[PDB]
């Protein structure tokens, strides 16, 4: 029902809901895209396809994998303009941690800073709540790899393997049947499941050009975007 | 109709109607015609009277020694842009010790009128500026709009029934380059006389002419020294 201006601005419904934020969760879904994150024993893998509908459209200017710092990469879903403006907020406050505190920012402390900013968009009632989603990875000392997610509502929690985009309900139903049956996770064990979870939801069996893979491992903590040659190496590896 | 209220609200067709309403405010003012030769730029205006005892509302106003403008529409937006216009001319006169070229001054006006056409609670400027002057490369005739689209024209007319004023111009635009001032001026006021009812034309109370030239500062005549220009005319046919 409508009461006052509950359908328009960020105020409470009579039921206790507020509709503008839950209108923003399906603002992601017009992107037509699905991102998957999987954390393993000593590595974390981002995998996301892209759609290039034009031959006149370039190849290097499409990729959603955004290197925040030398050890933290991220992927973006939702609409594009809200996603990119989210990134320079993250790039700016990562650098302020180095200037104010000296040492390198943890991956968990960054999602506190982002979600508290995205609170104020919801919290104040004269500003648009930035309908895009956020997924981070990174290596921590004495904690291993991590995977987090920020939301336009402004809440975060860690995960073990969690997808985003359009097809969460199909991918997370696949991963719950996949994770909990006592799987030991090597490096390529995480990568092969990261493609084949997406390859069964979308049912593609793709060329090595559509997807991108960002990786981080505790032997080389630098964030690293793979090349289509070594993407093709892992792709035929699961082709038995 | 509910999206036709504020400047900020776009239309579902994609036309902000507040600017389209401000174009109608320009069409309510009295007509005026500006044009130029190779070496001179002459704009001729038409005055109106509120009553018989009241004096006629003036149209042309001096800005600088080469720039002078005409007016159409409101009178608050007239003087508000006029005070901004006189200010910018003497600033570059104070800083660089040179007169402003006409072209980049008008670009300051389109930047000036841009902000109240985008932010909330601000009307556009209902105004009809015709601009004449010299830069270092000759005469120029400019026109503006409340949508801030300035046009480098050669002869235009804005205000009430300027529809007929434009039609006279293109069938004599080829003559507007070689002729000197005595027939250049009376080419221009042959265009005003079709923006009128068929029983009154120019009887030394409602017309003013401003001329800027090579060896000529921008000079405004009104109703007494206009009388040498108003001789040598044919009447309107029927």
């Amino acid at each position: 029902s409508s009461a006052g201006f509950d359908r328009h601005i960020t105020i409470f419904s009579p039921e206790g809901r507020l509709y503008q934020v839950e209108y923003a969760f399906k603002a992601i879904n017009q992107g037509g895209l699905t991102s998957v994150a999987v954390r393993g024993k000593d590595c974390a893998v981002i995998v996301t396809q892209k759609k290039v509908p034009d031959k006149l459209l370039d190849s290097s200017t499409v990729t959603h994998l955004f290197k925040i710092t030398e050890n933290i990469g991220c992927v973006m879903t939702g609409m594009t303009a809200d996603s990119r403006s989210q990134v320079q907020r993250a790039r700016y406050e990562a650098a302020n941690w180095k200037y104010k505190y000296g040492y390198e920012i943890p991956v968990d402390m960054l999602c506190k800073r982002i979600a508290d900013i995205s609170q104020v968009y919801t919290q104040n009632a004269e500003m648009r709540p930035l309908g895009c989603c956020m997924i981070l990875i990174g290596i921590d000392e004495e904690q291993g790899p991590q995977v987090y997610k920020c939301d336009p509502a402004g809440y975060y929690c860690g995960f073990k393997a969690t997808a985003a985009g359009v097809k969460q309900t199909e991918s997370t139903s696949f991963l719950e049947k996949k994770v909990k049956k006592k799987f030991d996770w090597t490096f390529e064990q995480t990568v092969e499941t990261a493609i084949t979870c997406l390859s069964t939801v979308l049912s593609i069996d793709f060329k090595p050009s559509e997807i991108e893979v960002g990786v981080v491992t505790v032997e080389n903590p630098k964030f690293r975007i793979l090349t289509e040659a070594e993407i093709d190496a892992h792709l035929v590896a699961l082709a038995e | 109709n509910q999206y036709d209220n504020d400047v900020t609200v776009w239309s579902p067709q994609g036309r902000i109607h507040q600017i389209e309403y401000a174009m109608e405010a320009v069409k309510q003012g009295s007509a005026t015609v500006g044009l130029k030769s190779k070496t001179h730029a002459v704009l001729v205006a038409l005055k109106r009277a509120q009553s018989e005892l009241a004096a006629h509302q003036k149209k042309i106003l001096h800005v600088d020694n080469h720039i002078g403008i005409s007016i159409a529409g409101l009178t608050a937006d007239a003087r508000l842009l006029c005070n901004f216009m006189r200010q910018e001319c003497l600033d570059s006169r104070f800083v660089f010790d040179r007169p402003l070229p006409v072209s980049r001054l008008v670009s300051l006006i389109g930047s000036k009128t841009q902000i109240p056409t985008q932010r909330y609670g601000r009307r556009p400027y209902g105004v009809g500026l015709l601009i004449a002057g010299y830069d270092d490369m000759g005469p120029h005739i400019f026109q503006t709009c409340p949508s801030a689209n300035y046009f480098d024209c050669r002869a235009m007319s804005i205000g009430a029934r300027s529809q007929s004023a434009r039609t006279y111009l293109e069938r004599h635009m080829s003559e507007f380059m070689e002729c000197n001032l005595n027939e250049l001026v009376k080419h221009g006021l042959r265009a005003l006389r079709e923006t009128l009812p068929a029983e009154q034309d120019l009887t030394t109370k409602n017309v003013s002419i401003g001329i800027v030239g090579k060896d000529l500062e921008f000079t405004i005549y009104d109703d007494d020294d206009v009388s040498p220009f108003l001789e040598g005319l044919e009447e309107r046919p029927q």
Partner: protein, 232 residues
């Protein structure tokens, strides 16, 4: 912004404030929680359900410390909780910079609710949707306070917020009494948490923090699994 600054919460013709009543509806649909003050310390207990088997449990926390003797839980919406935590973290420091002394538990509730009451009267913002429970053993006798989005605050021997908060209200009236111990208080706090929880109750389904006169302390999932023997 521009300088609109007008409050979106006005009086009803009946003489009530409607948006504050609607914010309490979001509190009642929150996660259930309980807090019991029994004669040597205060026991707080919440009801933390991960919606999937993929969530991490050692990342997001509910029992949250403010000082070394002051803890704080909630029942409402998640992201608005983390705002006034960081507000109350800083607000405890300006007492300590001035007075060089740990802040009493009654003194925060004067100040935290003053932030929260003024925030409703202010212009162009909604109220919060979080009720709180604040504990602390300051000067021997422990304390247990409860604020709300209406700006008010109270002082409970034992209370419960969240879902089925009136059912646990009748449960605490019969089961609890005047005096207990700290260990008896945890036993009945799980007993009212088992009243409304789901089937399995493990070390990750609930999360319990306590106060002592030795200080505020948060329990690890080991001892919560160890106290889970003789459940409820």
């Amino acid at each position: 912004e521009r300088g609109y600054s007008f409050s979106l919460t006005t009086f009803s013709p009946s003489g009530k404030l409607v948006q504050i009543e609607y914010a309490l509806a979001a509190v009642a649909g929150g996660a259930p929680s309980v807090g019991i003050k029994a004669a040597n310390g205060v026991v707080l207990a919440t009801e933390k359900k991960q919606k999937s088997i993929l969530y991490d449990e050692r990342s997001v926390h509910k029992v949250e410390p403010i000082t070394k003797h002051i803890g704080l839980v909630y029942s409402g919406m998640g992201p608005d909780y983390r705002v006034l935590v960081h507000r109350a973290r800083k607000l405890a420091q300006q007492y300590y910079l001035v007075y060089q002394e740990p802040i009493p538990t009654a003194q925060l509730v004067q100040r935290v609710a003053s932030v929260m009451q003024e925030y409703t009267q202010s212009g162009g913002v909604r109220p919060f949707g979080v009720s709180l429970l604040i504990c602390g053993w300051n000067e021997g006798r422990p304390y247990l306070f409860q604020s709300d989005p209406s700006g008010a605050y109270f002082a409970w021997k034992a209370t419960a917020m969240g879902k089925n908060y009136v059912n646990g209200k009748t449960f605490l009236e019969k089961r609890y009494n005047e005096d207990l111990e700290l260990e008896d208080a945890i036993h009945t706090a799980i007993l009212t948490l088992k009243e409304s929880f789901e089937g399995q109750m493990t070390e990750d389904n609930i999360e319990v923090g306590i106060c002592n006169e030795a200080g505020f302390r948060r329990l690890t999932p080991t001892e919560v699994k160890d106290y889970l023997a003789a459940i409820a």
